[PDB]
Design a protein around this ligand. Structure first.
Ligand SMILES: Nc1ncnc2c1ncn2[C@@H]1O[C@H](COP(=O)(O)OP(=O)(O)OC[C@H]2O[C@@H]([n+]3cccc(C(=O)O)c3)[C@H](O)[C@@H]2O)[C@@H](O)[C@H]1O
Ligand SMILES: Nc1ncnc2c1ncn2[C@@H]1O[C@H](COP(=O)(O)OP(=O)(O)OC[C@H]2O[C@@H]([n+]3cccc(C(=O)O)c3)[C@H](O)[C@@H]2O)[C@@H](O)[C@H]1O
Ligand SMILES: [Mg+2]
Ligand SMILES: [Mg+2]
Lengths: 188, 188
């Protein structure tokens, strides 16, 4: 099953920018499917806070369950420590020898690439697909694939701020995710 | 009474229309927002546009679920080209109760110098600009601004995409999608 997309994330919370870039890359590159890959500990944001894996997982399920071309990969949640993508992609490449993985990143992560653990070796394990994001730019010296989408400036940190400040989040993320955030008072 | 007006052609209406309407309604504590479809757009005369009953059908589908959104049918009676200045004269005289906030995206912010009776219009109504990717709010005119999570969705892209059978997931409401697809709008 050759062409598979994988979107790595903290998903804190998941939102329409995640679903948008996943669906757009899926159509653009004729992928068989897209795997959402939630991290246990974000390797670049190790000191911080972040909501439980359990609530992040539940949001992600809510966010993606409608979608049959979407599924959740738990490889990192079954590992201790910071979730380095090179380690994960090593495991998945050997578990799935007949898949060409396309790792999907937004503009801000394309810029941060030079600081990823084992970046140069990672680029040989996987095909990176960068997608534009307002305020970031897709220019990178690394040989990545690029897909054009209708850019959406929603972020997880913006959503967290707005929930705290009691500001509207309508049209920013799935209604099912909104329902769960408000029920459990995450981000207030 | 602070009331929003978003004039547009709505061919089709999409999440960018709904987003900006919601964003200003909350940021300016509006009582509600009116969607004002034009009979003939002043600046796209002839062009190639969808019928007014069809655009009206879609706009209803786009906004029906929304309690704080109604549609204003003022431009739909009489003449051809819908000049906003005339509309707002008529609305201002009719409801001296209400302070109208006319909502425009950044592309329409840019084109303001070419609007009919622009200077007299600015005296009539409060303009509210919202950013659009690929158009920052630079204007020498004294308009009110609200900061939004920008979405690069456009009507012409959706037209093009429907014609090419490309995905429109997350870009516009499902009810509107159902209508376009079933009547085979925008194809060829
Ligand atoms: N509005 C939007 N438009 C376009 N793209 C958008 C977006 N919002 C988020 N995104 C993108 O979606 C993805 C998920 O966002 P978010 O949930 O915040 O994810 P984030 O915490 O930024 O992490 C992104 C991925 O990169 C991995 N990473 C980062 C840094 C170093 C290393 C390493 O191994 O050394 C690995 C991390 O483990 C995860 O797999 C990101 O790629 C982000 O850029
Ligand atoms: N993604 C996005 N992000 C931010 N804003 C977005 C947007 N997509 C549409 N918009 C905005 O939504 C609104 C509606 O979109 P669209 O259907 O394409 O509307 P459009 O045809 O641009 O018309 C905008 C309004 O301006 C009026 N106008 C235009 C030119 C001259 C004059 C005149 O009186 O001489 C009047 C026109 O009759 C209509 O009422 C527009 O303001 C557009 O800029
Ligand atoms: Mg990020
Ligand atoms: Mg426009």
């Amino acid at each position: 099953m050759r062409k598979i997309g994988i979107i790595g994330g903290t998903f804190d919370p998941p939102h329409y920018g995640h679903l948008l870039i996943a669906n757009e890359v899926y159509h653009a590159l004729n992928l068989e499917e897209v795997w959402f890959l939630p991290n246990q500990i974000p390797p670049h944001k190790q000191g911080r806070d972040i909501t439980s894996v359990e609530s992040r997982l539940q949001m992600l399920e809510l966010a993606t369950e409608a979608e049959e071309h979407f599924s959740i990969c738990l490889e990192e949640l079954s590992r201790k420590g910071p979730s380095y993508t090179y380690d994960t992609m090593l495991q998945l490449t050997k578990k799935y020898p007949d898949v060409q993985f396309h790792f999907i990143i937004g503009g801000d992560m394309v810029e941060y690439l030079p600081k990823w653990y084992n970046i140069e070796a990672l680029l040989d394990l996987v095909t990176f697909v960068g997608v534009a994001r307002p305020g970031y730019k897709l220019r990178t010296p690394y040989p990545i694939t690029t897909v054009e989408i209708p850019e959406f400036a929603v972020s997880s940190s913006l959503l967290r701020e707005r929930y705290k400040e009691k500001k509207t989040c309508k049209y920013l993320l799935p209604e099912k995710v909104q329902v769960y955030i408000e029920r459990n008072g995450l981000y207030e």
